[PDB]
Design an enzyme around this catalytic site. Structure first.
Site, PDB file in Angstrom:
ATOM      1  N   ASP B 222       0.833  -1.210   0.000  1.00 27.25           N
ATOM      2  CA  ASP B 222       0.000   0.000   0.000  1.00 27.25           C
ATOM      3  C   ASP B 222       0.867   1.258   0.000  1.00 27.25           C
ATOM      4  OD1 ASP B 222      -2.429  -1.350  -0.039  1.00 27.25           O
ATOM      5  OD2 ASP B 222      -2.699  -1.264   2.137  1.00 27.25           O
ATOM      6  N   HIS B 223       1.887   1.257   0.849  1.00 22.93           N
ATOM      7  CA  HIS B 223       2.834   2.369   0.931  1.00 22.93           C
ATOM      8  C   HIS B 223       3.488   2.635  -0.425  1.00 22.93           C
ATOM      9  CE1 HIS B 223       6.514   4.231   3.251  1.00 22.93           C
ATOM     10  NE2 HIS B 223       5.937   5.088   2.425  1.00 22.93           N
ATOM     11  N   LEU B 224       4.005   1.577  -1.043  1.00 25.15           N
ATOM     12  CA  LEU B 224       4.676   1.714  -2.330  1.00 25.15           C
ATOM     13  C   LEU B 224       3.691   2.165  -3.399  1.00 25.15           C
ATOM     14  CD1 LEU B 224       6.837  -1.454  -1.904  1.00 25.15           C
ATOM     15  CD2 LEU B 224       7.738   0.852  -2.105  1.00 25.15           C
TER      16      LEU B 224
END
Lengths: 234, 234
Positions: B222-224
Site C-alpha cells: 500500500d505504501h509503495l
C-alpha cells in the site's frame, strides 16, 4: 492538566519559565537511561522546547525566545542544541523572528544584521548548516503533535490556529531559503524553490526589505538587494 | 597529503577504516576545548564522516556505510549522531542506499522494508524526524566543501564528479520526500514538492517500485502504491 494549564496561559516570562521547568523535569528523568525508548521520549521533549521558541517568535516576544536556552540546564542543553547549534541559536532566533514578523505584517524596525552578528554567521558554511538545522526544528515543532493534547500556537487563538501555523511555517521556509541559497539567490534553480510562496507574502517581503536596506552597511544592502531581485524574478 | 592519499584510494574496508581513524584523531584533539572555534571545526569534521557514508552508498557498498558508525569512538559518536540519530542510522543508510541505487539504474534486489526495520521506523514521528535529519546531512556532505582540497565522490571519477553529485543529491532529496510526506503522498501540496524530479528518474522509480512491491506484506505494498501514484500524478 497542570502542564496543559501552563501552556494555555498568556505568554509571559513567568509562564514560559514554568513550562520549561516542567519539560526539563521530564527530560531529567530520562537522562540516566540510554535505551532507544528514552531517546524517543527525549526527541519529543526537545520538540516541545522548540514549540515554545516558535510560539514566542510568532507572538513578537523575541526576548523570551532567546531565554528558553537559558532556562534549560546545561546537561539537557547539550542534547537539545547539539554541537554548533548552541552557538548559532541567537542568530537563528533573530532571523526566524524577523521573517515571521514580516509575514505577519509587522512594520518594523528590525535590528541591523551586521550589528547582531547574523551577517558574520552567514559567512561561515558550517554556521549556515547549523542555522538551517534550527530553523527546520522551529518549523517541525509547530506542525507535528508535540504534546499529547492539542495546544494552540498562540494562546486564545483557537479557530485561527491552523491559519497561523500555515503562515508561520511558510515564513520559516523562507528563512530557510535565505540561508540555503546564500550568495546564489538569483540562480534559476534557487528561484524555482520560491514556488511555494504566496504572491502577497512575496510583496510584503519586497516592501519590508526595501525599507530595511536603507542606510545599512553596503554588504548588507547588496545581500538584501539579491533577495529582492530573486523575489521579483520568481 | 597523507589524508588526501587515503581519500583517493579505491573504496575498501581498509581504506575506509584508515580515513575514519584520521578524522577521529582530529576530532579527539578538539574534544577538550569548548569554545566556538572548536565547535566549528567539529561541525566540519562531522560532515567529513557523512561524506564517507554517502560515497559508500553511491558506490553500492552499503555494508561499509553502516560500518562508519562502528569505527567512531563513542564520545565522538555522541556528537556526530546526536540523540535519536544514533538509533535510526541503520534505517537512514538503508533508505538512502535504496533510493540512490534506483537513481543510478541498479536492477535490485533490495531488502524488504519491514524485515530491516525501516517500515516500523516510519510509523514513529520522532524517528521520521531523525531519519530526515540524517538524509539531509548525507546530502550537504557532498555539496559543501568538507575538505580543504577537492575530493571526488567516487574514486577515479573526476570529469563526471559534478554529474554524479547532481544525481546523488536528487536521489537523497527524493528519499527525504518519502519520509516527510509519509501517508500524505498524493496530497496536492505533496505532489508539488516533486517538481524538482527529472521525468526519467521518475520513470525509473515507478518501474523499480512496481517490481519491489510484488509479494511484499500488504502494508508495504500500500505504501509503495501511494508513492507510485504520486509519481504518476506529478
Amino acid at each position: 492538566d497542570k502542564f496543559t494549564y501552563l501552556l494555555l496561559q498568556p505568554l509571559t516570562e513567568a509562564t514560559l519559565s514554568d513550562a520549561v521547568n516542567f519539560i526539563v523535569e521530564k527530560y531529567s528523568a530520562e537522562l540516566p537511561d540510554e535505551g532507544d525508548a528514552s531517546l524517543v521520549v527525549r526527541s519529543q521533549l526537545g520538540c516541545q522546547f522548540f514549540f515554545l521558541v516558535t510560539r514566542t517568535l510568532a507572538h513578537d516576544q523575541r526576548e523570551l525566545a532567546k531565554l528558553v536556552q537559558t532556562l534549560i540546564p546545561r546537561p539537557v542543553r547539550l542534547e537539545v542544541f547539539p554541537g554548533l547549534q548552541r552557538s548559532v541559536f541567537k542568530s537563528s532566533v533573530f532571523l526566524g523572528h524577523h521573517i515571521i514578523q514580516i509575514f505577519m505584517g509587522a512594520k518594523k524596525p528590525f535590528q541591523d544584521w551586521s550589528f547582531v552578528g547574523l551577517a558574520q554567521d552567514f559567512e561561515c558554511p558550517w554556521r549556515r548548516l547549523a542555522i538551517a538545522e534550527l530553523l527546520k526544528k522551529f518549523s517541525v515543532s509547530v506542525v507535528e503533535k508535540v504534546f499529547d493534547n492539542p495546544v494552540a500556537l498562540i494562546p486564545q487563538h483557537e479557530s485561527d490556529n491552523e491559519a497561523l501555523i500555515e503562515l508561520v511555517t511558510n515564513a520559516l521556509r523562507f528563512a530557510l531559503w535565505i540561508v540555503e541559497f546564500y550568495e546564489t539567490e538569483t540562480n534559476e534553480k534557487s528561484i524555482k524553490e520560491l514556488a511555494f510562496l504566496d504572491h502577497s507574502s512575496k510583496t510584503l517581503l519586497i516592501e519590508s526589505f526595501t525599507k530595511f536596506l536603507q542606510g545599512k552597511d553596503v554588504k548588507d544592502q547588496d545581500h538584501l538587494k539579491r533577495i529582492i531581485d530573486a523575489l521579483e524574478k520568481s
